[PDB]
Design a protein around this ligand. Structure first.
Ligand SMILES: Nc1nc(SCCCN2CCCCC2)nc2sc3c(c12)CCCCC3
Ligand SMILES: Nc1nc(SCCCN2CCCCC2)nc2sc3c(c12)CCCCC3
Ligand SMILES: Nc1nc(SCCCN2CCCCC2)nc2sc3c(c12)CCCCC3
Ligand SMILES: Nc1nc(SCCCN2CCCCC2)nc2sc3c(c12)CCCCC3
Ligand SMILES: [Cl-]
Ligand SMILES: [Cl-]
Ligand SMILES: [Cl-]
Ligand SMILES: [Cl-]
Ligand code: NA
Ligand code: NA
Ligand code: NA
Ligand code: NA
Lengths: 396, 396, 396, 396
């Protein structure tokens, strides 16, 4: 049982583990496009001797954080252990090796999407964004008088084929991802992938349509089996006008009973309607998970709330260092100290605070975050809070 | 069609409308206990001529708001129009008369629980609290190492019969309701009611049990039909230790597969577990709705966040007045002005901001709240935000 | 195995067979009220030796037929064979004995409600009325401009308790049953029974409410388990105005999603709505079954369509006689003949034609009704057709 | 927003609206075969400026009406408004333009199949045929002694592949459609379409089989997911013998639990069985909708019942003219008058009466049809009634 970087001979055996480990496996044709995002020495395999019984890799990503700051981010993916090799500490050995390489490479944070919620906490990953499915019964949906874009004359929104308006989607997404915490750069090869999934599959998904505004788009398709449900796969809106305009078009899908979308907890859609209760939360789950690789680099890189007045404290991350933390004028200075800790937390808890999805007060109440000063707790809450609500970009 | 205060002759006819309008009607035996909370001239009936074709009333309540401030609150309830008299503007006439009496009586706010989400917005009520159902698959549930009360020696929690420990529940609730925004005073007659529902009913609900801590309780019963589901009807915890201790006991119900509870979005329970994903949000909805009766009285009565620095603005409520609003040191001064408005909103939107459940930024994005100053929006957000998360007390 | 009229000693043993044979058995308390409708020698029991292993009886009923003519009718009911005695020709022996007594007593027709659709055809019973369940999604339901009772001012309909308005229901029903084919006289003891079922049962049915017009009523209750469904148990309307008025009230039940009713195929309700498709047929089945005991007496008693011109024919009922049938001026003369048959049918087929529910053309196409003259078929169709659509009164 | 006849440049944009508006869209390959049935100037498009935001067309059809009379019929289809352009009166403008062209072209009637039951009533369309789904549990099904084709010797019915017996299906259908009200001429291109859908699709429908008699056929396939259900897509029988013979073969499908078919309310199938209750009505809905374009032309073209004696009246269609109507010897004469109206109805109500599906008495009871003479109502009922029951041909 040896842990190595895979050669080109190892990949056929990795795809077999992938096929047997992930249901959604789209096969080696689209594996070619995701492979370009893996750097040299981005991948580890465990061989028994011989076959592949374990793999993990990371991809080079660009993650937007509060203050419209863009961090180089190691995206962990394709993590699998063979059903023949469970409870052998392969995951722990592979994660330990990639984290070593990620840190040495100079990535301040790593990120992943979790197949289960009970695995990644112990390797220092905290859930950092919340997926929030809204299902609108669009037969009852009436827009509030206050709602934008209810005036006479033409609609700004067009119904289009995705593949004929690639340039415009790219441009709108690029604007979106730079202004929103949780935003990821989407490279050309993932746009090739996205627009390939937009066409109908034999005995599979139905054809995707697009609603296009100057400052937003919505990709959607009718459900395979439930022909009265439209699923919005992706809605990117740069302005409140574009968001409302796009939803007026989606509520216009008069052959549908229900529109569902996976969005964020602060989606304004419910407030656009006369009955806020028509936008039912049907599903909630963790989205992006964050491991803070370099605590000082990460805390200094993001912006903080300007409303909270300047304050200093000593933060201890369990096995992650102890730091004098000074926050004022929406910037942080984070420097080594041996002074007594005022705040203690595990590294995963910091990940969960970092994009403003979770409040320090909430984590404190569960004793995940320890301090003996309630004032300092209120000040952390306010500082780490994100002006622009955190959203989830795309699964990787 | 005449609108009057009901005499004792009108009540038999009101109960018939209640029976035909509300399914959960427990009949006139428990109507005697809710009737004590209705003041003289708290009720209006519409007669056709003759029978009752419309009714509405309010009850005298005490609602806790941010800053542990307790407001006299008109609780609207028992609102019904006969199926024979729809679309006749009876609701609008009854609401207009009660609001007149509520205002003249000197209540700064009114509140209700909504049977539908599309009715009460137009009479100035805004959803102010969020109900959040968590369903825990307790077969997988393991408490995090950080979680309080995992040490050796005795449990602090006892399994008891509710009716034998009334005094202790009352005391714990009284402590809870005074420290939590959304808290309501529960008078003796509603404790009589609650402990009567605690016993098993023939072909109805099963027997309620209680878990009792010094600083918290949980009332729960097994589901009528699903015998592997335990429903927590009510969990009141004054300390984080009590909350964790009570949940360790509930996760100890080893004959159950699932524990469900209707709680608030900031419930720390998910963070007490090694797998946060085991506490699934199964249901979300509006809880308490708030109509601000006197804008200056209400805005001046509540506490604000100490973290935001002193700031002044001019708020206009549509048909509710225009005010110079000055917030600093967690207090507000709200005085008449004819100066140009900086913020505009309908009266319902103010209700939704008032207990900190909804962010001004969110409502602004839906154009329910208008300003041309993003800095002022950030400052409102921060100020109106509640240190202690808003919870829902009991339905009325 | 001996077939006899039961003595008062036999009844305890009949109730046990009833309990074991019919689920809906309400027990001997309400068996006292149905027993009054059984004449002396109206009942047969089969004893093994000793216990009751078979029973059947008939009740004295008054059935309205086309031409507002009221026939004395033997109502077959309480028909059961013990599970220990199947395939022993007990049903055939009991039916043969009661039919003998019914004929000798001078009843022109017998009737029953069938537990299965494959039993009673061979004893000469034909399905004569059609039950037709309409389920209205009342959230979408809007009344057509043409619909009666949409004007300003008071409603004619009142929401009442059934038991407080017995006299008025009785009177309206009595008017209804005399003008509608399928109508049955409802004696005092069955009104006692109906108004006893109107009150709520512990772990059973919910409380029944009534909508009362001068010329119609609707009894309804909310479903045990589905709390958004209202079931209309009984709607009697003497005028089109009363029918529309009552449905405007039922569509006013704003807490309900769906109203269901068991009605007849020609119910005008769908045409009262802007969308006829909102009144979905959810269920269809045979209602009342008819055995013509005396062919000439029955054919001469009912009225026929005045529109068809006078015509003569020879009808043969298989083992029921052969008759010269002359129909003109909406009356029939039916006299013995040995002349060649022009029409042949089994006795059950005549039952199915007799109230106008089924067309001779339809039964002819299935070769249940034989003739070599298509003109005669058209003339039978037209003659037997009922001006007033046939309805089902109550189950017995 | 301009309304025009589409050029060949407009069609790509029409197919995109079709794809986004109709789920069942089979794509432009089969759009080529339906396009041949659209005359020059049979189509209208609405452009925004530019893209297609609205379309509607009509096809040249031949509809059989009572008296085996065949009318030229404008078949409205492919009617869609873009979700971006709702509530802009595009449907009303397109329907107004096509109705103008249809009338000027000299079509006496137009017809459509409705996607919802609440749209087309206001443009003068009445539901004229009833779809009636029967589901037979064929494990219990035993044919009555009276049923044709139960004798010894060979079956007349053969199990065949559809595509190998096109000529014979065509011939039988052609005979069927000329003798049945609701019948449509099926042109060669729709037989090409029907026999292309008869073969199995990858991850789609299973292979269609045919039962072939000299005087009837039944096309059927096993359900995609429910492998114990056979769906009869189409059963055409010219004689009662052929209908019974085909059903004896379908009840012979011994691997199936259930046979379902969409048929008409007067289908004799239930009467072919010993238990009529085995043929359960599972579904009912409106089929073909009829707009009478020229009232006199339409009323004079159809045959009437010979049984009703000669009678005269004055019919007023709301905004459709007023006519002296004289019916006798199964023919109508319909001429202009200013004499006082005896009958009044909207144009949609006439459509609903025209093929005999709905009775004037039923529509009168809902006040859709006004007269102060009950005798005249009985005479209309009898006259408009169809000897041959009305069936639905194929959806367009
Ligand atoms: N990284 C890749 N992603 C995808 S699509 C998103 C899947 C959802 N997840 C399912 C399990 C939990 C995490 C999210 N496809 C592919 S294919 C492929 C990789 C990859 C990883 C890079 C190496 C080349 C092979
Ligand atoms: N006010 C009362 N409450 C209750 S229990 C909570 C019901 C849930 N709601 C269901 C509908 C929406 C609002 C909440 N029971 C009673 S009984 C009664 C009153 C009353 C109102 C006071 C007048 C005496 C009669
Ligand atoms: N005749 C009676 N009816 C009823 S209620 C309707 C039952 C539905 N059926 C269920 C099975 C198929 C027929 C209809 N209850 C009773 S109780 C009783 C009799 C009786 C029959 C008369 C003799 C006294 C005992
Ligand atoms: N007219 C056409 N029909 C069909 S198949 C029946 C569909 C069911 N409906 C679904 C919605 C309600 C009405 C019935 N396919 C096509 S494809 C096509 C047309 C068309 C209309 C003619 C213009 C060429 C394009
Ligand atoms: Cl999102
Ligand atoms: Cl709560
Ligand atoms: Cl009925
Ligand atoms: Cl059909
Ligand atoms: Na809005
Ligand atoms: Na914890
Ligand atoms: Na009407
Ligand atoms: Na037959």
């Amino acid at each position: 049982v040896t842990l190595c970087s895979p050669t080109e001979d190892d990949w056929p055996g990795m795809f077999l583990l992938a096929a047997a480990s992930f249901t959604d496996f789209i096969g080696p044709e689209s594996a070619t496009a995701w492979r370009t995002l893996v750097p040299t020495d981005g991948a580890v395999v465990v061989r028994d001797g011989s076959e592949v019984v374990g793999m993990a890799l990371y991809m080079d990503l660009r993650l937007t954080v509060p203050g419209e700051v863009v961090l180089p981010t190691a995206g962990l993916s394709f993590v699998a252990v063979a059903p023949t090799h469970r409870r052998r500490g392969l995951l722990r050995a592979m994660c330990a090796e990639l984290h070593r390489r990620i840190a040495d490479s100079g990535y301040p944070v790593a990120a992943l999407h979790a197949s289960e919620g009970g695995i990644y906490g112990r390797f220092g990953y905290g859930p950092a964004t919340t997926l929030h499915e809204l299902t609108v019964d669009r037969r009852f949906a009436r827009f509030h008088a206050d709602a934008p874009g209810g005036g006479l004359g033409g609609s700004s929104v067009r119904l289009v084929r995705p593949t004929e308006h690639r340039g415009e989607f790219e441009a709108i997404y690029e604007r979106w991802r730079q202004q929103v915490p949780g935003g990821l750069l989407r490279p050309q090869v993932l746009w090739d992938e996205l627009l390939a999934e937009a066409k109908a599959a034999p005995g599979g998904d139905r054809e995707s349509f697009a609603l296009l505004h100057p400052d937003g788009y919505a990709l959607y398709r009718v459900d395979r089996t439930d022909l009265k449900l439209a699923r919005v796969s992706e809605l990117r809106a740069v302005t409140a006008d574009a968001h409302c305009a796009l939803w007026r078009a989606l509520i216009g899908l008069d052959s549908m009973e229900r529109i569902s979308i996976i969005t964020h907890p602060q989606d304004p859609l419910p407030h656009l309607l006369t009955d806020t209760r028509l936008a039912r939360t049907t599903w909630r789950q963790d989205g992006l998970w964050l491991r803070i690789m370099n605590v000082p680099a990460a805390l200094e890189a993001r912006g903080y709330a300007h409303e909270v007045g300047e304050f200093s404290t000593v933060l201890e991350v369990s096995d992650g260092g102890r730091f004098a933390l000074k926050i004022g004028d929406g910037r942080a200075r984070c420097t080594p100290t041996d002074a007594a800790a005022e705040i203690e937390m595990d590294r995963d808890v910091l990940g969960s605070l970092y994009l403003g999805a979770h409040r320090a007060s909430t984590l404190a109440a569960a004793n995940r975050l320890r301090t003996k000063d309630s004032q300092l707790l209120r000040r952390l809450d306010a500082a780490f809070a994100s002006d622009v609500p955190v959203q989830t970009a795309f699964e990787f």
